[PDB]
Design an enzyme around this catalytic site. Sequence first.
Site, PDB file in Angstrom:
ATOM      1  N   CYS A 154       0.816  -1.208   0.000  1.00  0.00           N
ATOM      2  CA  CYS A 154       0.000   0.000   0.000  1.00  0.00           C
ATOM      3  C   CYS A 154       0.850   1.259   0.000  1.00  0.00           C
ATOM      4  CB  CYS A 154      -0.884   0.071   1.234  1.00  0.00           C
ATOM      5  SG  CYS A 154      -1.471  -1.496   1.898  1.00  0.00           S
ATOM      6  N   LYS A 157       3.005   1.786  -3.272  1.00  0.00           N
ATOM      7  CA  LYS A 157       2.015   1.850  -4.355  1.00  0.00           C
ATOM      8  C   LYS A 157       1.314   3.195  -4.337  1.00  0.00           C
ATOM      9  CE  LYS A 157      -2.151   1.259  -3.334  1.00  0.00           C
ATOM     10  NZ  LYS A 157      -2.806  -0.070  -3.323  1.00  0.00           N
ATOM     11  N   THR A 252       2.076 -14.498   8.773  1.00  0.00           N
ATOM     12  CA  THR A 252       3.160 -14.604   7.795  1.00  0.00           C
ATOM     13  C   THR A 252       2.807 -14.116   6.395  1.00  0.00           C
ATOM     14  OG1 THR A 252       2.447 -16.889   7.531  1.00  0.00           O
ATOM     15  CG2 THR A 252       4.287 -16.529   8.986  1.00  0.00           C
ATOM     16  N   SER A 290      -5.725  -8.027 -11.646  1.00  0.00           N
ATOM     17  CA  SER A 290      -6.091  -7.703 -10.277  1.00  0.00           C
ATOM     18  C   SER A 290      -5.979  -6.201 -10.002  1.00  0.00           C
ATOM     19  CB  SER A 290      -5.157  -8.441  -9.329  1.00  0.00           C
ATOM     20  OG  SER A 290      -3.802  -8.032  -9.579  1.00  0.00           O
ATOM     21  N   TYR A 291      -6.389  -5.798  -8.792  1.00  0.00           N
ATOM     22  CA  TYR A 291      -6.208  -4.392  -8.461  1.00  0.00           C
ATOM     23  C   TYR A 291      -4.720  -4.025  -8.435  1.00  0.00           C
ATOM     24  CZ  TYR A 291      -4.978  -5.152  -3.477  1.00  0.00           C
ATOM     25  OH  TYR A 291      -4.347  -5.463  -2.286  1.00  0.00           O
ATOM     26  N   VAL A 292      -3.837  -4.971  -8.087  1.00  0.00           N
ATOM     27  CA  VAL A 292      -2.413  -4.663  -8.120  1.00  0.00           C
ATOM     28  C   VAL A 292      -1.965  -4.442  -9.557  1.00  0.00           C
ATOM     29  CG1 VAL A 292      -0.128  -5.683  -7.727  1.00  0.00           C
ATOM     30  CG2 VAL A 292      -1.904  -5.763  -5.926  1.00  0.00           C
ATOM     31  N   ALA A 293      -2.382  -5.326 -10.467  1.00  0.00           N
ATOM     32  CA  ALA A 293      -2.014  -5.166 -11.872  1.00  0.00           C
ATOM     33  C   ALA A 293      -2.415  -3.798 -12.393  1.00  0.00           C
ATOM     34  CB  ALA A 293      -2.665  -6.287 -12.708  1.00  0.00           C
ATOM     35  N   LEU A 294      -3.676  -3.398 -12.136  1.00  0.00           N
ATOM     36  CA  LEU A 294      -4.171  -2.169 -12.713  1.00  0.00           C
ATOM     37  C   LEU A 294      -3.544  -0.961 -12.037  1.00  0.00           C
ATOM     38  CD1 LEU A 294      -7.914  -2.997 -13.401  1.00  0.00           C
ATOM     39  CD2 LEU A 294      -5.875  -3.420 -14.783  1.00  0.00           C
ATOM     40  N   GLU A 295      -3.347  -1.033 -10.718  1.00  0.00           N
ATOM     41  CA  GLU A 295      -2.716   0.075 -10.007  1.00  0.00           C
ATOM     42  C   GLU A 295      -1.319   0.330 -10.540  1.00  0.00           C
ATOM     43  OE1 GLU A 295      -3.043  -1.015  -5.930  1.00  0.00           O
ATOM     44  OE2 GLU A 295      -5.000  -0.101  -5.667  1.00  0.00           O
ATOM     45  N   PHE A 319     -14.823  -7.864  -7.972  1.00  0.00           N
ATOM     46  CA  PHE A 319     -15.376  -6.528  -7.783  1.00  0.00           C
ATOM     47  C   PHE A 319     -16.566  -6.352  -8.719  1.00  0.00           C
ATOM     48  CE2 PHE A 319     -12.162  -4.396  -5.168  1.00  0.00           C
ATOM     49  CZ  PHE A 319     -11.024  -5.197  -5.375  1.00  0.00           C
ATOM     50  N   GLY A 387      -1.856 -13.094  -8.823  1.00  0.00           N
ATOM     51  CA  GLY A 387      -2.248 -13.739  -7.600  1.00  0.00           C
ATOM     52  C   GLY A 387      -1.135 -13.794  -6.574  1.00  0.00           C
ATOM     53  N   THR A 437      -4.761  -4.264   4.908  1.00  0.00           N
ATOM     54  CA  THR A 437      -3.939  -3.905   6.064  1.00  0.00           C
ATOM     55  C   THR A 437      -4.756  -3.473   7.276  1.00  0.00           C
ATOM     56  OG1 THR A 437      -1.863  -3.418   4.891  1.00  0.00           O
ATOM     57  CG2 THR A 437      -2.390  -2.036   6.772  1.00  0.00           C
ATOM     58  N   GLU A 571     -20.707  14.893  -2.044  1.00  0.00           N
ATOM     59  CA  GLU A 571     -22.053  15.357  -1.756  1.00  0.00           C
ATOM     60  C   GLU A 571     -23.068  14.779  -2.715  1.00  0.00           C
ATOM     61  OE1 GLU A 571     -23.027  19.582  -2.616  1.00  0.00           O
ATOM     62  OE2 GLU A 571     -21.183  19.698  -3.844  1.00  0.00           O
TER      63      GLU A 571
HETATM   64  C1  LIG Z   1       1.040  -4.344  -4.374  1.00  0.00           C
HETATM   65  C2  LIG Z   1       0.171  -4.594  -3.144  1.00  0.00           C
HETATM   66  C3  LIG Z   1      -0.519  -3.438  -2.856  1.00  0.00           C
HETATM   67  C4  LIG Z   1      -1.398  -3.413  -1.778  1.00  0.00           C
HETATM   68  N1  LIG Z   1      -2.170  -2.196  -1.504  1.00  0.00           N
HETATM   69  C5  LIG Z   1      -3.025  -2.187  -0.383  1.00  0.00           C
HETATM   70  C6  LIG Z   1      -3.773  -0.941  -0.085  1.00  0.00           C
HETATM   71  O1  LIG Z   1      -3.656   0.062  -0.752  1.00  0.00           O
HETATM   72  N2  LIG Z   1      -4.609  -1.002   1.050  1.00  0.00           N
HETATM   73  C7  LIG Z   1      -4.762  -2.182   1.912  1.00  0.00           C
HETATM   74  O2  LIG Z   1      -5.452  -2.190   2.889  1.00  0.00           O
HETATM   75  N3  LIG Z   1      -4.015  -3.365   1.590  1.00  0.00           N
HETATM   76  C8  LIG Z   1      -3.162  -3.343   0.464  1.00  0.00           C
HETATM   77  N4  LIG Z   1      -2.452  -4.531   0.198  1.00  0.00           N
HETATM   78  C9  LIG Z   1      -2.667  -5.675   1.117  1.00  0.00           C
HETATM   79  C10 LIG Z   1      -1.712  -5.587   2.262  1.00  0.00           C
HETATM   80  O3  LIG Z   1      -0.376  -5.519   1.839  1.00  0.00           O
HETATM   81  C11 LIG Z   1      -1.932  -6.889   3.080  1.00  0.00           C
HETATM   82  O4  LIG Z   1      -3.300  -7.100   3.325  1.00  0.00           O
HETATM   83  C12 LIG Z   1      -1.139  -6.771   4.361  1.00  0.00           C
HETATM   84  O5  LIG Z   1       0.219  -6.467   4.143  1.00  0.00           O
HETATM   85  C13 LIG Z   1      -1.242  -8.138   5.027  1.00  0.00           C
HETATM   86  O6  LIG Z   1      -0.647  -8.031   6.267  1.00  0.00           O
HETATM   87  P1  LIG Z   1      -0.188  -9.441   6.975  1.00  0.00           P
HETATM   88  O7  LIG Z   1       0.135  -9.126   8.439  1.00  0.00           O
HETATM   89  O8  LIG Z   1      -1.213 -10.515   6.743  1.00  0.00           O
HETATM   90  O9  LIG Z   1       1.110 -10.009   6.201  1.00  0.00           O
HETATM   91  P2  LIG Z   1       2.410  -9.213   5.624  1.00  0.00           P
HETATM   92  O10 LIG Z   1       2.277  -7.709   5.678  1.00  0.00           O
HETATM   93  O11 LIG Z   1       2.734  -9.801   4.266  1.00  0.00           O
HETATM   94  O12 LIG Z   1       3.568  -9.618   6.678  1.00  0.00           O
HETATM   95  C14 LIG Z   1       3.999 -10.941   6.832  1.00  0.00           C
HETATM   96  C15 LIG Z   1       5.503 -10.860   7.256  1.00  0.00           C
HETATM   97  O13 LIG Z   1       5.877 -12.053   7.752  1.00  0.00           O
HETATM   98  C16 LIG Z   1       7.163 -12.509   6.908  1.00  0.00           C
HETATM   99  N5  LIG Z   1       7.222 -13.941   7.070  1.00  0.00           N
HETATM  100  C17 LIG Z   1       6.648 -14.869   6.291  1.00  0.00           C
HETATM  101  N6  LIG Z   1       6.943 -16.082   6.777  1.00  0.00           N
HETATM  102  C18 LIG Z   1       7.716 -15.876   7.867  1.00  0.00           C
HETATM  103  C19 LIG Z   1       8.270 -16.782   8.728  1.00  0.00           C
HETATM  104  N7  LIG Z   1       8.279 -18.216   8.803  1.00  0.00           N
HETATM  105  N8  LIG Z   1       9.015 -16.394   9.760  1.00  0.00           N
HETATM  106  C20 LIG Z   1       9.193 -15.071   9.973  1.00  0.00           C
HETATM  107  N9  LIG Z   1       8.644 -14.150   9.118  1.00  0.00           N
HETATM  108  C21 LIG Z   1       7.881 -14.567   8.070  1.00  0.00           C
HETATM  109  C22 LIG Z   1       6.891 -12.027   5.717  1.00  0.00           C
HETATM  110  O14 LIG Z   1       8.138 -11.993   4.923  1.00  0.00           O
HETATM  111  C23 LIG Z   1       6.430 -10.564   6.054  1.00  0.00           C
HETATM  112  O15 LIG Z   1       7.475  -9.743   6.385  1.00  0.00           O
HETATM  113  C24 LIG Z   1      -1.548  -4.540  -0.953  1.00  0.00           C
HETATM  114  C25 LIG Z   1      -0.805  -5.660  -1.213  1.00  0.00           C
HETATM  115  C26 LIG Z   1       0.008  -5.695  -2.321  1.00  0.00           C
HETATM  116  C27 LIG Z   1       0.884  -6.869  -2.690  1.00  0.00           C
END
Ligand SMILES: Cc1cc2nc3c(=O)[nH]c(=O)nc-3n(C[C@H](O)[C@H](O)[C@H](O)COP(=O)(O)OP(=O)(O)OC[C@H]3O[C@@H](n4cnc5c(N)ncnc54)[C@H](O)[C@@H]3O)c2cc1C
Lengths: 588, 588
Positions: A154, A157, A252, A290-295, A319, A387, A437, A571
Amino acid sequence: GTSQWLRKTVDSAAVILFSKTTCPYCKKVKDVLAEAKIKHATIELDQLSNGSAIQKCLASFSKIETVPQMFVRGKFIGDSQTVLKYYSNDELAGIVNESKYDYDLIVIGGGSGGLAAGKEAAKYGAKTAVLDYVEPTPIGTTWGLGGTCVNVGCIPKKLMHQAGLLSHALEDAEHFGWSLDRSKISHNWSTMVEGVQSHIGSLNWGYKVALRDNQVTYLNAKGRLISPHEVQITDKNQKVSTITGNKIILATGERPKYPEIPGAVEYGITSDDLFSLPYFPGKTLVIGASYVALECAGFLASLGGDVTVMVRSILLRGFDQQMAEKVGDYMENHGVKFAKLCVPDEIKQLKVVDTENNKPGLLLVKGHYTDGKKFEEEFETVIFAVGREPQLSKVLCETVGVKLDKNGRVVCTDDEQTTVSNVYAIGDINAGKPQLTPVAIQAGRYLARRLFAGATELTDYSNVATTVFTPLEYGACGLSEEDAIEKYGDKDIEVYHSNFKPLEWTVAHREDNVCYMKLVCRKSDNMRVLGLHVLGPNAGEITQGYAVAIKMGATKADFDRTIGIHPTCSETFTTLHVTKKSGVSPIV
Amino acid sequence: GTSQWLRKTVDSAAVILFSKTTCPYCKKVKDVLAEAKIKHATIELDQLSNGSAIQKCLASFSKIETVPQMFVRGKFIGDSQTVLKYYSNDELAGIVNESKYDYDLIVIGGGSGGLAAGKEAAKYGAKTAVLDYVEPTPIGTTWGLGGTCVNVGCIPKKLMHQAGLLSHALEDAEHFGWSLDRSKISHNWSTMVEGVQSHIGSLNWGYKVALRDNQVTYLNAKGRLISPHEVQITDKNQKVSTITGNKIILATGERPKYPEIPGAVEYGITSDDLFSLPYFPGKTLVIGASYVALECAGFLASLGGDVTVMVRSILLRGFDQQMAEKVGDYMENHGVKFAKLCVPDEIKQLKVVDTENNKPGLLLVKGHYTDGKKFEEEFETVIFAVGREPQLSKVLCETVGVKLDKNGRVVCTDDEQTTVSNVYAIGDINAGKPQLTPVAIQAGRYLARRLFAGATELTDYSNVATTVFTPLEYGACGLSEEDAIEKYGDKDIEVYHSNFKPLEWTVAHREDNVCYMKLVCRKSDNMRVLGLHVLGPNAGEITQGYAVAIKMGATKADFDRTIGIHPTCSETFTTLHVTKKSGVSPIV
Ligand SMILES: Cc1cc2nc3c(=O)[nH]c(=O)nc-3n(C[C@H](O)[C@H](O)[C@H](O)COP(=O)(O)OP(=O)(O)OC[C@H]3O[C@@H](n4cnc5c(N)ncnc54)[C@H](O)[C@@H]3O)c2cc1C
Ligand SMILES: Cc1cc2nc3c(=O)[nH]c(=O)nc-3n(C[C@H](O)[C@H](O)[C@H](O)COP(=O)(O)OP(=O)(O)OC[C@H]3O[C@@H](n4cnc5c(N)ncnc54)[C@H](O)[C@@H]3O)c2cc1C
Ligand SMILES: Cc1[nH]c2ccccc2c1CC(=O)O
Ligand SMILES: Cc1[nH]c2ccccc2c1CC(=O)O
Ligand SMILES: [Ca+2]
Ligand SMILES: [Ca+2]
Ligand SMILES: [K+]
Ligand SMILES: [K+]
């Protein structure tokens, strides 16, 4: 309910004080604990409906019905006099630090959910460890603490989106009277990336500082749950160790998928690489819709890129498809090319990336359209956005007994509990939940409070609003039109809609009747708003406030009775009158 | 209720059809009327709780209890057979056009409220005239149809605000990677004004077309209500005439006040002049501290102007003073000078405006501070923003019997009725109501429906959200903090607040801990949100959606349970936790 709740609260809390607002002995203990730098949860019984009942059930744990009562890790520790006894004898530290486990909480994963859960837990005296490790991408990209949103999601991006919006601000500025020669204005990708990365770096550091300031142990190590309470960690040195925890939170996240075609892993990149890419992508093909592709396609085009999106079937699957079509039409009208009904067959390398002068390489993409025509075109950069997938070992999850679904995501109760009762899962690996997030953060904070402070509030995953930060932004909250009609039937759905034009677009000579909003309502239920959709600038700011009203059960009448703020885009939601069934045009 | 409602509906409607969804004879009449191009209201009795009762009370007017029943101007006209009789005999046109008065509705004033009321009334067959006349300002400025917001208010103000915001977009663009030499970039006032005025012109024309398309008579004439149903009109030629109307809507708005000091009318200007000013104001003094004063000062500074605001006492009197102070502090930190606790004594002319080369003149402003020090400084332009006032003749209003208050505003019931029962007042001259364009529009549309289509819905003037379009915008909905504490007492008020930083400001190197939001809540009432306040970009888009939730009775818990959209400014409202009573800092 009271006794089951009390049993789980006492069992689970690390350090908890049952108290009353009005109790001098309670404040005595609070001050001794604060003095001793002992963090804890507090439940003020006089602020609870059932406080009376709770105070008496406590005797089933304490043999007393007085306040204050302090518990540590399921054990009644004492009333005021006993706590001061331990304090006076310098025994208190050892009591509050006695446990069968190294930690009250181990969080596996330092992203949006895991950092939120770990910090919140630590507030209530849970001794907490957060593990984070970023497995490098195929070309070797890695990053620091904070997870996908902070590093490769996020945050960067939306910053690159803003850089793209500024292209249109530069255009608009002329019409508003500013004297600038756009012919002489260009964009420098690597200057942008350096700024973005400096901000990400400040977040990486900030999270490390936040964890230190809450006495959370941060381990930059890969964690592996090998039994319900044992986590095996591998540090950078490859040193393996084991730590134990009472509660475990799996947080994770996911990583990008690659298509199974020759050349994809070797020569393509994903969003993981894009946000720190040392060279400008140049002429770019985005595979995916996906939304990532288009963004990503959208901001690359606004930064001057020659951009193509290869679409297998439809845009923004899942969507509202009317809105998805409008999002894509805007993009096509503003530079983005679409190779529709097309898939890739192979990626061939024509030039290697210039790691010295920070120039892209060159790739030949071969694919085919549904109509049998071959796709064969050169691109400097190829981005896969097809994906994302979780990274949990199915085998080892089976061993410990954590159930996964078809897709490798963790199957959880509505309180995030896995099939191993001390192990919880939040964020993107929680099967069925919106992958966002603020969802992960709310889930982790609320879970921490239930584990360690006796809270009962669950996370509400219904009607979670979203925004797609395409060049023209798309905000939504609730059901798509098609899902509402499938659920309730076409006769029970009324859709109010309108085009609109931002005032800002008038002097700037931008489009009429492109921005668009609609409310999907249920006739049988007093015209309840089931879904809200808006295509327009600042669509996330527009949508957010309405998500509160929708969560409260807003109806069309509630929108109508509210007075607009003028001049705004938002509005228009307060004066919608054209229905789809009327056949009347929504243009204005 | 039913019979009193029916009596007023039948008496007041111009052409109204009582019908049912399911009635073939009703559709017969509807089609004959549509065929004959006869507009009318329709009440479908089968869609009303009390439809049963209504249908029977109709016999007190018609002597029948069947549908359809058509009425014209208080007279039952017939069932289906009688309407077709009139049609067949080509008598129907004359029946629906028979009246004691020239018009069913005369609207005096063609601004936000009056145009909205006139168009809505015409939809239901009310033969409508809209009068509009723009009395020239002292220097001779005039403009076309549409009223204050369209010509000299919200529309040009927000467009010039946007031009100002684009200054900061140009600055930000460098940090986001754009290559532009700002040293070489300047702003051209007259290019901006030409664009703004071209848009205003398109609105003037559009309203004229809209009135023509709804068969509303537009008279560019000054109207004077000389008896309850008689309006004397004076055209440009000074030709005087008289027209009669059943219902009268006063929608004449206000104009700027001038201070009673030498030189003010001769050498100063107001907002009426600013938005079409042919020359750039140059070094400018704004006298006043209303939202208009600050909005105007703010965009002039962002366009490169040397700007000073002379403040008699406080900023934004009537608004939350914590937020007003933050608004002003931002402005002072970004170029705007404030001469605080200062009033003007005289304006002396040093140069006449150059009407040929479109350059400003030059003025000497003498005033004094509360501390006794004299103010004496030269300005190219002096703008008075010291209040606005209605323009109704008290004497003639007395004659007809329309009551005015101390301030010359019209004293109205909660259905906009004046003390003359066929005369109504909407918009800024309605005493006690929020002076805002969407308020006037909602009032006029809702009034038209009650007059001519049997509607009952009143305008709700409570918790009307606002936004001040200062350089950093300020949105609000509900009570200021101080008004909430005065009403309910300090012990019953909890205030949650936070600073925040737009993500867009990070790479751009703008301020931490300047944007700010708060929720003022009532503890005794389940933490009901009494007031919402936000200082930040796009503050009107932020605030609007929450106004719906507040109108529905939102509580803090309703905000907390809603999930944020990330990354946005608005989402911070969903995670507020610091209270003012805790003493904890709101910085982040
Ligand atoms: C391009 C992109 C754009 C996005 N834009 C938005 C947006 O605008 N608004 C929004 O709300 N959401 C957005 N998202 C979604 C958002 O990034 C996720 O929903 C959010 O980061 C998920 O949080 P999380 O805690 O589940 O996992 P993550 O944030 O992915 O964190 C998991 C962490 O754990 C690490 N990890 C994995 N396995 C292990 C392990 N065994 N041991 C230790 N560490 C490990 C990972 O490497 C990572 O650092 C976007 C996602 C992407 C890819
Ligand atoms: C600088 C400024 C900025 C503003 N910004 C905003 C904003 O951002 N958002 C918002 O909601 N509101 C804003 N307002 C308020 C908004 O302009 C008013 O609330 C709105 O215009 C009031 O509408 P109205 O119908 O009451 O009267 P008006 O719009 O003033 O229309 C009255 C019309 O009737 C004419 N008239 C007067 N007497 C006669 C007569 N005897 N015969 C015929 N015609 C007559 C008048 O000349 C005028 O054309 C702003 C106002 C000002 C001055
Ligand atoms: C990425 C993705 N998820 C799906 C789920 C169901 C059907 C198809 C897809 C696709 C590809 C596509 O949209 O064609
Ligand atoms: C314009 C205006 N309306 C008021 C109402 C009450 C007290 C003072 C004022 C001022 C001047 C000021 O703010 O000093
Ligand atoms: Ca409304
Ligand atoms: Ca929340
Ligand atoms: K795909
Ligand atoms: K004043």
